[PDB]
Design a protein around this ligand. Structure first.
Ligand SMILES: Cc1ccccc1-c1cc2cc(C(=N)N)ccc2[nH]1
Ligand SMILES: [Ca+2]
Length: 223
């Protein structure tokens, strides 16, 4: 997260860290047994880490649970990142508490202008590299689809939306991928892609979760 702020320990209880010997992507807990992340974060040997703040220090509220199965969206296209969403099932149900909680799925899509909360352990520099140990936060508005498509001609599909600031300075970044974009208490987006980080006229691109609620619900119910 670039241009953001330190969230505060466990202030984003649904935020998860995907670990394969190191943190490589974020995710969102949707119930005690399932996590939603980006399809481009897919990999074998995933360990889901819940209740995390400083990902390099065991602070006392963590839960480390291995994934038993991963399900990448059937229509995911790695070249364009269309349908960049995946589900991860925990080998054992997480113990839900104030520091480890699920985030609700949307019942409808969010409108442009709605303010959302984006979070992650990604790079905090727009130019260069610096990875935080604690969770970073960023409040950003959903941008109009026209401003989104103008920034990325022929690259935006109905399954993506942009959020952030066209002036630059505030954006998600490498390492935040797969993480949550929560608006009005609903998981509306997944950190997916963009151009560089916090660059002018190049806002972040997010997977439009509201288009996948039926798939998520049916897939979890059958697995
Ligand atoms: C997914 C991917 C695949 C291959 C190269 C780069 C990416 C990429 C670009 C961005 C850009 C942002 C951003 N909000 N600036 C966040 C994450 C992110 N991931
Ligand atoms: Ca920790």
């Amino acid at each position: 997260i670039v241009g953001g702020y330190t969230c505060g320990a466990n202030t984003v209880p649904y935020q998860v860290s995907l670990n394969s010997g190191y943190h490589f992507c974020g995710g969102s807990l949707i119930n005690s047994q399932w996590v939603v992340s980006a399809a481009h974060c897919y990999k074998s040997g995933i360990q889901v880490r819940l209740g995390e703040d400083n990902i390099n220090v065991v602070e006392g509220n963590e839960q480390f649970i291995s994934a038993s199965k991963s399900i990448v969206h059937p229509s995911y296209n790695s070249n364009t990142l269309n349908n960049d969403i995946m589900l991860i099932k925990l080998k054992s149900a997480a113990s839900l508490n104030s520091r480890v909680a699920s985030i609700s799925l949307p019942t409808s899509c969010a409108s442009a202008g709605t303010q959302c909360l984006i979070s992650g352990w990604g790079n905090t520099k727009s130019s260069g590299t610096s990875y935080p140990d604690v969770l970073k936060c960023l409040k950003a508005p959903i941008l109009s689809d026209s401003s989104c498509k103008s920034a990325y001609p022929g690259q935006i599909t109905s399954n993506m939306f942009c959020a952030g600031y066209l002036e630059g300075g505030k954006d998600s970044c490498q390492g935040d991928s797969g993480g949550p974009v929560v608006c009005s208490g609903k998981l509306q987006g997944i950190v997916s892609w963009g151009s560089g980080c916090a660059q002018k006229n190049k806002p972040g691109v997010y997977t439009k979760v509201c288009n996948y609620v039926s798939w998520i619900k049916q897939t979890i119910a059958s697995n």
